[PDB]
Design a protein around this motif. Structure first.
Motif, mmCIF file in Angstrom:
data_model
loop_
_atom_site.group_PDB
_atom_site.id
_atom_site.type_symbol
_atom_site.label_atom_id
_atom_site.label_comp_id
_atom_site.label_asym_id
_atom_site.label_seq_id
_atom_site.Cartn_x
_atom_site.Cartn_y
_atom_site.Cartn_z
ATOM 1 N N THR A 36 -7.087 -43.954 -45.852
ATOM 2 C CA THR A 36 -5.868 -45.118 -46.737
ATOM 3 C C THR A 36 -6.032 -46.269 -45.696
ATOM 4 N N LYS A 37 -5.734 -47.291 -47.048
ATOM 5 C CA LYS A 37 -5.653 -48.894 -46.046
ATOM 6 C C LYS A 37 -4.749 -48.673 -44.786
ATOM 7 N N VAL A 44 -9.780 -48.552 -42.521
ATOM 8 C CA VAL A 44 -9.154 -47.502 -43.181
ATOM 9 C C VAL A 44 -8.642 -46.943 -41.505
ATOM 10 N N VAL A 46 -6.465 -42.549 -40.917
ATOM 11 C CA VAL A 46 -6.275 -41.374 -41.257
ATOM 12 C C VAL A 46 -5.578 -40.511 -39.874
#
Ligand SMILES: OC[C@H]1O[C@H](O[C@H]2[C@H](O)[C@@H](O)[C@@H](O[C@H]3[C@H](O)[C@@H](O)[C@@H](O[C@H]4[C@H](O)[C@@H](O)[C@@H](O)O[C@@H]4CO)O[C@@H]3CO)O[C@@H]2CO)[C@H](O)[C@@H](O)[C@@H]1O
Ligand SMILES: OC[C@H]1O[C@H](O[C@H]2[C@H](O)[C@@H](O)[C@@H](O[C@H]3[C@H](O)[C@@H](O)[C@@H](O[C@H]4[C@H](O)[C@@H](O)[C@@H](O)O[C@@H]4CO)O[C@@H]3CO)O[C@@H]2CO)[C@H](O)[C@@H](O)[C@@H]1O
Ligand SMILES: OC[C@H]1O[C@H](O[C@H]2[C@H](O)[C@@H](O)[C@@H](O[C@H]3[C@H](O)[C@@H](O)[C@@H](O)O[C@@H]3CO)O[C@@H]2CO)[C@H](O)[C@@H](O)[C@@H]1O
Length: 95
Positions: A36-37, A44, A46
């Motif tokens: 995700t951003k 990014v 996670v």
């Protein structure tokens, strides 16, 4: 002591995924789990749920079959926070 495996990843890919084996278990279904951003431009992120003292082996991809797999060796991440940038992993957040 750290549990989950949290990863910041430097990429311009729009649909980055992480394909991995956690604690030598099953590899994820290709192409793995999206990142995700993050709060940092160009990164990014996670968080992979894990127990204390975990490690995973990972290859990143752009969601369409282009890969970043550390010269075919994969990347190793342990419980806690790390950042991967240009093939190098350091503890903590983007520098
Ligand atoms: O934003 C400035 C830069 O933008 C552009 O760089 C982008 C690339 O276009 C993306 O494709 C991606 O980069 C990938 C890269 O394509 C892929 O090979 C891989 O590169 C890793 C390599 O596997 C690894 O072993 C080690 O050498 O590090 C490499 C990265 O340096 O993974 C990349 C990340 O997903 O994202 C970058 C932005 O992060 C543009 O091309 C650049 O010239 C520009 O500076
Ligand atoms: O199972 C019932 C589903 O049936 C229909 O879905 C089909 C597609 O029409 C097929 O094209 C194919 O889908 C592939 C797809 O072509 C491909 O691009 C890829 O998409 C991935 C992507 O690479 C990845 O980055 C991430 O974004 O997830 C995407 C979706 O997974 O992979 C697809 C297969 O996973 O096959 C499916 C069925 O498997 C119908 O459109 C669906 O609504 C229906 O649920
Ligand atoms: O080693 C060469 C091998 O590469 C190709 O196999 C890949 C699969 O096509 C791909 O799905 C993936 O397999 C993993 C699954 O996604 C996951 O659900 C699970 O079952 O773990 C699998 C890996 O153990 O990756 C493999 C390996 O790259 C190609 O299709 C083969 O023909 C070829 O022999």
């Amino acid at each position: 002591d750290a549990t989950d495996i949290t990863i910041y990843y430097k990429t311009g890919w729009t649909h980055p995924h992480i394909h991995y084996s956690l604690n030598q278990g099953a590899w994820t279904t290709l192409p793995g789990v999206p990142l995700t951003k993050s709060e940092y431009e160009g990164y990014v992120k996670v968080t992979i749920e894990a127990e204390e003292g975990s490690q995973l082996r990972a290859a990143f991809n752009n969601g369409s079959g282009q890969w970043d797999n550390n010269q075919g060796r994969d990347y190793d991440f342990s419980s806690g926070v790390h950042t991967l940038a240009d093939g190098r992993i350091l503890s903590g957040t983007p520098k």
